[PDB]
């Protein structure tokens, strides 16, 4: 009659963790994808050429303006 | 069943006045008073017939009431020395019902202290090696208790008795110096520990400090009780070096363990006289003779080349000796204090140098007075 | 430097909200230890155009602020703007 | 009789696994938001070794520059012929690369 | 672990400005704050720091107060505007060490294991060197106590960065680089 | 709708893992926190509440906040096994209340004692006239097992307030089995 009430209060102990981890998901996700909507309202999305890939997860950019860019973290795609 | 404990353990009057407190204290359900008073019940030095008869009953309640595990059980497993008097069944009991049982920060390592310390009279540094090593594998940064360093010093010293690395007796003596919390070091009980102290950090040759540990007084407090002429040649294990009576007498008295040290303690003072002469002698003589070497080193005129080249190969000094005239040449060295609390060298060299370069820096200023302009 | 369109995006907003509302233009390139490369201005009303825009009570600092012979797009946009003096105040405990 | 401890352990399993996995993808996508620090580079090829610290790079649409390394980008590795990643503002060399050109060598 | 650092005087003015915050209103007379650090290499680097609203009492000298919204979510806003900068340690004034140092050491180690605090001075007319750096290890003693977290010292030093003296060295004007031969070395001599 | 700053000073000493309270003294002082947060919320939802401990550690653990969910999250993994420190545990409470910016909120401090420690009556009468200067009437609700009828806490409450004060009900613990509600029956209306 005592351990069951302990699990009842531990359900709320885990529900506070649910609240905070769903906050670290959702409220941070609003930050991330509001920044990404801020990257999703632009002038173009400049077409380019990805030629190789690196690991010391990378992606290279060679545009139709013949400009060879690079980014080390790729962002909203996968390899 | 509390009536069973009352009829069983209460083997004398006046004692049950707190056992009635125990058989009400379980109804009060408060067990920090267990953690104090029943730990005192564990603590009692006597013949102790009741505690070993009742430890099985206390295990019968320890299966249920989530005891404070290491304290009473580990201090009582050596109060079992009236009840069972056998580690070969106590190791079964211990490792079977205690490896899953702990209440501390790190008490699996005190469990390993129990294992290693109860495999002394039944085991000899073969399987205890891995697990006693595993103790300090698991220490490394943890002991915010450091009361387990009592039993860790126990595994340290009682396993250092099992030979291997005599240079860890300066460190194991640091462990003895850094094991106990309060001051309580016995005198007539740790004079036997002076007998293992002096005559287990003396004979072996991993040590090379020669008077550094002799600065610390908790060993001489135990050595003045021991025989004074052994302690006189211990006092001669300082910068007094030739002293043909002193080390002769400890070769008279200390009968065993003087076979591998046959001339190698002489080799130790033969390498140690070089550092004692390039540090003791008031330098500006560093390229010098050889008869003081062949006099203080208790070596001959011929055997100083073995002396200097082996002492260079050791690594306490690195100067290439002028060998054509047996003329010494020295470098960096290890000090053993200057004048009694470093008065004279400190003053007449350090402050003399202070006012030297300070006042001649003022002279640099004096001629460089307006060259800044 | 130049007087951006970002100025005429947010400057009316912050002169609605705040009063002094100083625009600030910056560059780090032109030196590393010895220049004042940041630039700052302020939008002028259209309503003061009935007044001739030549009063200034202490004309030493306009004789020091007009003095650097203002460069390109500032006086490309003398209208909608009026300049402001930026000294470095007494900061000697940090300076020493 | 005490399956509410397993209704609490199951709430732990389900709710904590789901919120931790959502916040784990949110951890890696907060790192994708942290990639708004890793904001772009340029790429060129080393054309020669100008001085021991200088190199002439090749903007692939055009002009040629004078660059340096980051600090420790192995100035012996950056031989004329390698491809590097160039900085955006400072324009200097950031990271070496492989590649080379037309597959009429490769397809045979 | 921490051996030598790279520290730029933006943290120094970030000490002096909170000194301007609590100097004229001086009631607890101390600037204690948090050292953000762009931990890049074994050599450390700082380009940001903030001062916590803080007190430290004398009686039992272990009463002290952070501001964990100002500690957590201000750091989160900082991580959003600069994720390269993260925590590395903290700083304080009152160069005489005390007993609460080990308590804020206990809490500074859980944020960063090889943390380092900074003893400062608000008026260095020194030889001189600037502010201090430690290293917190556990060596416990030759004594046998529970864990002794005694402050070991990191040799502190100063680095540099592009475009961060642009107006300041312009204001001093007393800059004299190439004169070694009359003065710049005799100062070192005297020193 | 009284505006107050309630800072309960919890006890996680080494006497608080036993079962004279219902199974668990964690749940006992937890229910005491529950009744004070719910009750002060029912008198005012716009208060601010923080917990803190004194057994060998005093922290910046909770922000003084009306949200009882944070406090109830911090009533888990408390582990009452520490050495109870009575000296710093109240100076830390009042310097927490001097780290306030809403001081139109009045001040209320309560503390839970379930452990004996000895003290001079000077070392509490000075702190009691200090509290008379510090404008807090402290309502110590005693829990646990205890020295029955401590005069030190008695003289502390007696010289803590006089001249028609708030009426600090020093509720000493009933020695033996009771609940987490019969001991807060009396101080919840007037502490």
Helix (H, G, I), strand (E, B) or coil at E75: helix
The 8-class DSSP code of residue B127 comes to: S
Cβ atoms of residues E39 and E113 within 8 Å: no
Looking at CA atoms only, how far is residue D52 from chain E in angstroms?
21
Cβ atoms of residues B2 and B18 within 8 Å: no
How does strand E86-92 pair with strand E32-37? antiparallel
Cα distances (angstroms) measured from residue F43 to each of B34, F37, F47, F181: 42, 10, 9, 19
The angle formed by the CA atoms of residues E29, E53 and D27, to the nearest 5 degrees, is: 150
Which residue from F122, F114, F121 is spatially nearest to F89, judged by alpha carbons?
F114
The set of residues, in sequence order, having a beta carbon less than 8 Å from that of C20 and lying 6+ positions away, is: C42
- All residues of chain C having their beta carbon less than 8 Å from the beta carbon of residue E13 are 94
Q: At what angle do helices B168-177 and B148-160 cross, to 10 degrees?
A: 150
| Residue E128, preceding peptide bond in cis (omega within 30° of 0) | yes
- D52: exposed, middle or buried (C-beta count within 10 Å: 0-12, 13-18, 19+)? exposed
Which conformational region is residue C70 in: left (phi greater than 0), alpha (psi within -120 to 50 degrees), or beta?
A: beta
* A–D CB contacts, 8 A cutoff, strictly below: 114
Residue that is written with structure tokens 């943290």 in the block: E11
Neighbour subunits, C (≥3 Cβ pairs < 8 A): E
- DSSP assignment string, C63-91: HHHSTT---SSTGGG-TT-EE--------
Cα gap F29→F71, rounded to integer Å: 12
**What are the residues facing D67 on neighbouring strands?**
D55
- CA E34 from chain center: how many Å? 8
The set of residues, in sequence order, having a beta carbon less than 8 Å from that of D93 and lying 6+ positions away, is: D46, D55, D57, D67, D68, D69, D70, D73, D78, D84, D85, D86, D87
Cα gap B18→B38, rounded to integer Å: 10
E126–chain C Cβ distance below 8 A for any pair: no
- CA D90 from chain center: how many Å? 17
Cβ atoms of residues E33 and E15 within 8 Å: yes
Residue that is written with structure tokens 């003015």 in the block: E13
Cα gap D76→D53, rounded to integer Å: 10
Q: Which helix (H) or strand (E) holds E62?
A: none
Token pair of B333 as six digits: 């060295």
Q: Which helix (H) or strand (E) holds B313?
A: helix B304-314
Which residue from B317, B251, B240, B250 is spatially nearest to B286, judged by alpha carbons?
B317
Cβ atoms of residues C24 and C7 within 8 Å: no
The angle formed by the CA atoms of residues E91, E93 and E97, to the nearest 5 degrees, is: 90
Which residue from E54, E55, E50 is spatially nearest to E77, judged by alpha carbons?
E50
Cα distances (angstroms) measured from residue E126 to each of B163, B359, E9, F129: 56, 21, 16, 45
Token pair of C9 as six digits: 């995006």
**Touch of D by E (3+ CB pairs closer than 8 Å):** yes
Strands (E), chain A: 59-62, 68-71
Q: Which helix (H) or strand (E) holds D49?
A: strand D48-49
Cα gap F51→F37, rounded to integer Å: 11
Helix (H, G, I), strand (E, B) or coil at C40: strand
Cα gap F191→F188, rounded to integer Å: 6
Token pair of F130 as six digits: 């200090």
Q: Show which of residues 92-131 on chain F sit within 8 Å of chain E, judged by CB atoms.
A: 92, 95-96, 98-99
Cβ atoms of residues D68 and D44 within 8 Å: no
D89–chain E Cβ distance below 8 A for any pair: no
Cα gap D101→D83, rounded to integer Å: 12
Looking at CA atoms only, how far is residue C68 from chain E in angstroms?
17
Neighbour subunits, E (≥3 Cβ pairs < 8 A): B, C, D, F
How does strand F106-113 pair with strand F138-142? parallel
Residue that is written with structure tokens 């780290």 in the block: F99
The set of residues, in sequence order, having a beta carbon less than 8 Å from that of E123 and lying 6+ positions away, is: C93
Phi, psi of A70 (to 5 degrees): -155, 150
Neighbour subunits, A (≥3 Cβ pairs < 8 A): D, F
Residue that is written with structure tokens 């029943």 in the block: B38
Helix and strand numbers (H, E) in chain C are: 3, 3
Neighbours of B250 (CB within 10 A): 22
Neighbours of E181 (CB within 10 A): 9
Is the CB of A22 less than 8 angstroms away from the CB of D4? Answer: no
Task: Give the determination technique.
Answer: cryo-EM
Neighbours of E100 (CB within 10 A): 18
The 8-class DSSP code of residue D58 comes to: B
Helix (H, G, I), strand (E, B) or coil at F55: strand
Cα gap E12→E6, rounded to integer Å: 13
Q: Is residue C7 annotated as involved in ligand binding?
A: yes
Looking at CA atoms only, how far is residue E80 from chain D in angstroms?
7
The angle formed by the CA atoms of residues D34, A60 and D87, to the nearest 5 degrees, is: 70
- DSSP assignment string, B132-190: HHHHHHTTTT--SS-SHHHHHHHHHHHHHSS-S-TTHHHHHHHHHHTT-SSS---SSSS
- DSSP assignment string, E84-119: S-EEEEEEES-SS--STHHHHHHHHHHH-TT-EEEE
The set of residues, in sequence order, having a beta carbon less than 8 Å from that of E106 and lying 6+ positions away, is: E149
Residue that is written with structure tokens 């009026």 in the block: C82
Token pair of B169 as six digits: 């007796």
Give the up-direction half-sphere exposure of residue F168: CA atoms within 13 A in the CB hemisphere.
Answer: 28
Which residue from E17, E21, E11 is spatially nearest to E49, judged by alpha carbons?
E11
Cα gap B162→B124, rounded to integer Å: 7
Which residue from F136, F139, F46, F138 is spatially nearest to F98, judged by alpha carbons?
F136
Which residue from E86, E97, E94, E93 is spatially nearest to E136, judged by alpha carbons?
E97
Cα gap B64→B1, rounded to integer Å: 15
The set of residues, in sequence order, having a beta carbon less than 8 Å from that of F167 and lying 6+ positions away, is: F137, F161, F190
Token pair of C10 as six digits: 């947010």
Cα gap A74→A70, rounded to integer Å: 9
Nearest to E170 among C33, C94, C96 (CB): C33
Cα gap F55→F82, rounded to integer Å: 5
The 8-class DSSP code of residue F171 comes to: B
Q: Which helix (H) or strand (E) holds B241?
A: none
Helix (H, G, I), strand (E, B) or coil at C50: helix
Cα gap F92→E136, rounded to integer Å: 25
Neighbours of B73 (CB within 10 A): 22
Token pair of C26 as six digits: 């910056």
Residue from A1, A7, A8, A9 whose CB has the most chain F CBs within 10 Å, to mutate: A9
Is the CB of F20 less than 8 angstroms away from the CB of B30? Answer: yes
The angle formed by the CA atoms of residues B226, B230 and B236, to the nearest 5 degrees, is: 130
3-state secondary structure string, B54-86? Answer: HHHHHHHHHCCCCCCHHHHHHHHCCCCCCCCCC
Q: How many residues does chain A have?
A: 79
E138–chain B Cβ distance below 8 A for any pair: yes
Q: How many residues does chain C have?
A: 96
Residue that is written with structure tokens 């030297």 in the block: B356
The angle formed by the CA atoms of residues C78, C81 and C83, to the nearest 5 degrees, is: 90
Cβ atoms of residues A29 and D29 within 8 Å: yes
How does strand D55-56 pair with strand D83-86? unpaired
Sign of CA dihedral B249, B252, B257, B259: positive
Cα distances (angstroms) measured from residue B152 to each of B99, B133, B156, B192, B213: 17, 11, 6, 20, 21
- All residues of chain D having their beta carbon less than 8 Å from the beta carbon of residue A29 are 26, 29
Residue that is written with structure tokens 């007993």 in the block: E99
Which conformational region is residue E29 in: left (phi greater than 0), alpha (psi within -120 to 50 degrees), or beta?
A: left
- CA E24 from chain center: how many Å? 22
Cα gap B332→D41, rounded to integer Å: 54
Token pair of E65 as six digits: 């107060």
Cα distances (angstroms) measured from residue B237 to each of B171, B232, B297: 19, 9, 13
Token pair of D29 as six digits: 């996508």
**What are the residues facing D97 on neighbouring strands?**
D83
Cβ atoms of residues B128 and B119 within 8 Å: yes
Token pair of F111 as six digits: 């503390």
Phi, psi of B116 (to 5 degrees): -65, -40
The set of residues, in sequence order, having a beta carbon less than 8 Å from that of F107 and lying 6+ positions away, is: F4, F5, F97, F135, F136
Which residue from D85, D60, D102 is spatially nearest to A65, judged by alpha carbons?
D60
Token pair of F41 as six digits: 């919320």
Cα gap B87→B94, rounded to integer Å: 9
Cα gap B290→B301, rounded to integer Å: 7
Helix and strand numbers (H, E) in chain A are: 1, 2
Cα gap B323→B342, rounded to integer Å: 34
The 8-class DSSP code of residue B284 comes to: S
Phi, psi of D70 (to 5 degrees): -75, -75
Looking at CA atoms only, how far is residue A2 from chain F in angstroms?
6
Which residue from F151, F50, A38, C52 is spatially nearest to D39, judged by alpha carbons?
A38
Cα gap B179→E122, rounded to integer Å: 43
Cα distances (angstroms) measured from residue F103 to each of F37, F99, F106: 19, 10, 6
Give the up-direction half-sphere exposure of residue A23: CA atoms within 13 A in the CB hemisphere.
Answer: 6
Cα gap F11→F58, rounded to integer Å: 11
Token pair of F187 as six digits: 């101080």
**What are the residues facing B214 on neighbouring strands?**
none
- A23: exposed, middle or buried (C-beta count within 10 Å: 0-12, 13-18, 19+)? middle
End-to-end CA, chain B: 101
Token pair of B201 as six digits: 């950090």
How does strand E116-119 pair with strand E86-92? parallel
- E62: exposed, middle or buried (C-beta count within 10 Å: 0-12, 13-18, 19+)? buried
The set of residues, in sequence order, having a beta carbon less than 8 Å from that of D47 and lying 6+ positions away, is: D55, D56, D57, D58, D64, D80
Q: Which helix (H) or strand (E) holds E140?
A: none
Strands (E), F44-128: 48-53, 106-113
Cα distances (angstroms) measured from residue F160 to each of B90, B311, B325, F5, F53: 58, 75, 89, 18, 21
Which residue from E9, E7, E32, E10 is spatially nearest to E19, judged by alpha carbons?
E32
Cα gap B345→B228, rounded to integer Å: 33
The angle formed by the CA atoms of residues F141, F187 and F34, to the nearest 5 degrees, is: 80
The 8-class DSSP code of residue A61 comes to: E
Q: Which helix (H) or strand (E) holds F142?
A: strand F138-142
């Amino acid at each position: 009659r005592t351990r069951l009430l302990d699990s009842e209060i531990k359900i709320m102990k885990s529900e506070v963790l649910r609240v905070t981890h769903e906050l670290q998901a959702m409220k941070d996700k609003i930050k991330e994808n509001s920044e990404k909507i801020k990257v999703n309202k632009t002038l173009p999305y400049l077409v380019s050429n990805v030629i190789e890939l690196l690991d010391v997860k990378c992606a290279v950019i060679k545009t139709s303006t013949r400009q060879t860019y690079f980014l080390p973290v790729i962002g909203l795609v996968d390899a | 069943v509390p009536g069973f404990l009352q009829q069983s353990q209460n083997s004398g009057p006046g004692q049950p006045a707190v056992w009635h407190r125990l058989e009400e204290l379980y109804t009060k359900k408060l067990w920090h008073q267990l953690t104090l008073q029943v730990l005192d019940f564990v603590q009692d030095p006597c013949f102790a017939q009741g505690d070993g008869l009742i430890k099985l009953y206390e295990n019968f309640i320890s299966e249920f009431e989530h005891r404070v595990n290491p304290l009473s059980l580990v201090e009582i497993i050596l109060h079992v020395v009236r009840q069972m008097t056998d580690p070969n069944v106590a190791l079964t009991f211990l490792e079977k019902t205690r490896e899953k049982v702990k209440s501390s920060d790190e008490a699996v390592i005190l469990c390993k202290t129990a294992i290693g310390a109860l495999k002394l009279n039944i085991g000899d540094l073969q399987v205890t090696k891995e697990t006693i090593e595993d103790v300090e594998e698991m220490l490394n940064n943890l002991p915010g208790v450091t009361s387990v360093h009592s039993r860790f010093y126990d595994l340290s010293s009682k396993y250092y008795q099992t030979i291997g690395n005599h240079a860890s007796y300066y460190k194991d003596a640091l462990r003895f110096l850094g094991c106990v919390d309060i001051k309580d070091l016995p005198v007539s009980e740790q004079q036997e520990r002076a007998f293992t102290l002096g005559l287990a950090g003396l004979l072996g040759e991993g040590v090379f400090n020669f008077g550094e540990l002799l600065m610390h007084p908790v060993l001489e407090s135990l050595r003045n009780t021991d025989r004074q002429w052994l302690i006189d040649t211990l006092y001669a294990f300082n910068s007094g070096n030739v002293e043909r009576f002193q080390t002769l007498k400890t070769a008279w008295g200390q009968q065993p363990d003087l076979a591998a040290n046959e001339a190698q303690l002489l080799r130790k003072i033969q390498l140690l006289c070089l550092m004692e002469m390039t540090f003791t002698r008031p330098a500006n003589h560093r390229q010098l003779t050889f008869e003081e070497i062949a006099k203080s080193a208790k070596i001959t005129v011929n055997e100083v080349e073995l002396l200097v080249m082996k002492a260079l190969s050791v690594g306490l000094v690195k100067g290439s000796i002028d060998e054509v005239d047996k003329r010494v040449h020295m470098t960096w060295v290890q000090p053993r204090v200057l004048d009694l609390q470093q008065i004279k060298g400190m003053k007449d060299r350090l402050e003399f140098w202070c006012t030297d370069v300070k006042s001649m820096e003022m002279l640099v200023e004096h001629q460089a007075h307006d060259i800044l302009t | 430097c130049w007087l951006s369109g970002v100025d005429i995006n947010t400057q009316q907003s912050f002169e609605a909200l705040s009063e002094r509302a100083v625009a600030v233009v910056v560059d780090p390139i032109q030196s590393v230890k010895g220049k004042v490369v940041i630039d700052a201005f302020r939008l002028i009303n259209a309503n003061m155009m009935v007044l001739g825009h030549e009063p200034r009570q202490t004309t030493s600092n306009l004789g020091h602020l007009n003095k650097p012979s203002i460069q390109a797009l500032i006086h490309g946009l003398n209208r909608h703007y009026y300049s402001i003096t930026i000294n470095y105040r007494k900061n000697e405990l940090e300076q020493k | 009789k005490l399956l509410e401890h397993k209704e609490i352990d199951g709430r732990l399993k389900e709710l904590r696994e789901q919120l931790k996995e959502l916040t784990k993808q949110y951890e890696k996508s907060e790192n994708d938001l942290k990639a708004l620090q890793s904001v772009g580079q340029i790429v060129g090829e080393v054309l020669k070794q100008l001085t021991e610290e200088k190199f002439i790079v090749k903007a692939t649409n055009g002009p040629r520059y004078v660059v340096g390394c980051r600090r420790q980008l192995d100035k012996s590795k950056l031989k004329p012929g390698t491809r590097v990643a160039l900085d955006m503002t400072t324009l200097t060399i950031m990271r070496y690369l492989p590649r080379e050109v037309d597959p009429l060598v490769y397809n045979m | 672990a921490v051996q030598k650092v790279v520290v730029h005087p933006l943290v120094l003015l970030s000490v002096v400005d909170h000194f301007n915050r609590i100097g004229k209103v001086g009631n607890q007379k101390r600037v204690v704050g948090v050292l953000l650090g762009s931990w890049q290499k074994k050599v450390l680097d700082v380009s940001n720091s903030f001062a916590v609203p803080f007190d430290e009492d004398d009686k039992d000298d272990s009463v002290w107060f952070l501001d964990h919204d100002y500690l957590e979510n201000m750091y989160g806003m900082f991580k959003k505007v600069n994720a390269r900068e993260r925590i590395v340690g903290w700083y304080h004034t009152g160069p005489k060490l005390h007993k609460n140092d080990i308590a804020i050491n206990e809490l500074m180690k859980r944020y960063c294991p090889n943390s380092v605090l900074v003893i400062i001075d608000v008026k260095p007319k020194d030889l001189g060197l600037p502010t201090e750096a430690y290293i917190s290890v556990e060596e416990v003693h030759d004594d046998g106590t529970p864990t002794s977290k005694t402050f070991e010292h990191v040799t502190s030093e100063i680095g540099a960065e592009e475009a961060e003296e642009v107006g300041v060295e312009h204001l001093l004007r007393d800059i004299k680089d190439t004169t070694v031969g009359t003065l710049s070395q005799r100062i070192t001599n005297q020193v | 709708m009284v505006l107050e700053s309630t800072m309960v000073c919890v006890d996680n000493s080494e006497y608080m893992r036993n079962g004279d309270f219902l199974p668990t003294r964690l749940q006992a002082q937890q229910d005491a926190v529950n009744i004070v947060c719910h009750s002060k919320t029912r008198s005012n939802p716009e208060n601010n509440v923080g917990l803190i401990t004194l057994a060998n550690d005093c922290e910046v653990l909770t922000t003084l906040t009306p949200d009882t969910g944070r406090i109830l999250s911090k009533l888990h993994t408390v582990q009452p096994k520490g050495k109870i420190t009575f000296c710093t545990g109240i100076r830390v409470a009042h310097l927490a209340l001097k780290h306030r910016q809403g001081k139109n909120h009045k001040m209320r401090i309560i503390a839970f004692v379930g452990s004996p420690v000895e003290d001079n009556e000077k070392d509490l009468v000075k702190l009691a006239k200090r509290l008379k200067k510090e404008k807090v009437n402290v309502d110590i609700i005693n829990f646990g097992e205890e020295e029955v009828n401590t005069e030190k806490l008695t003289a502390f409450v007696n010289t803590l307030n006089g001249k028609d004060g708030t009426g600090s009900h020093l509720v000493t613990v009933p020695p033996g089995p009771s609940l987490a509600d019969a001991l807060i029956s009396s101080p919840i209306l007037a502490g």
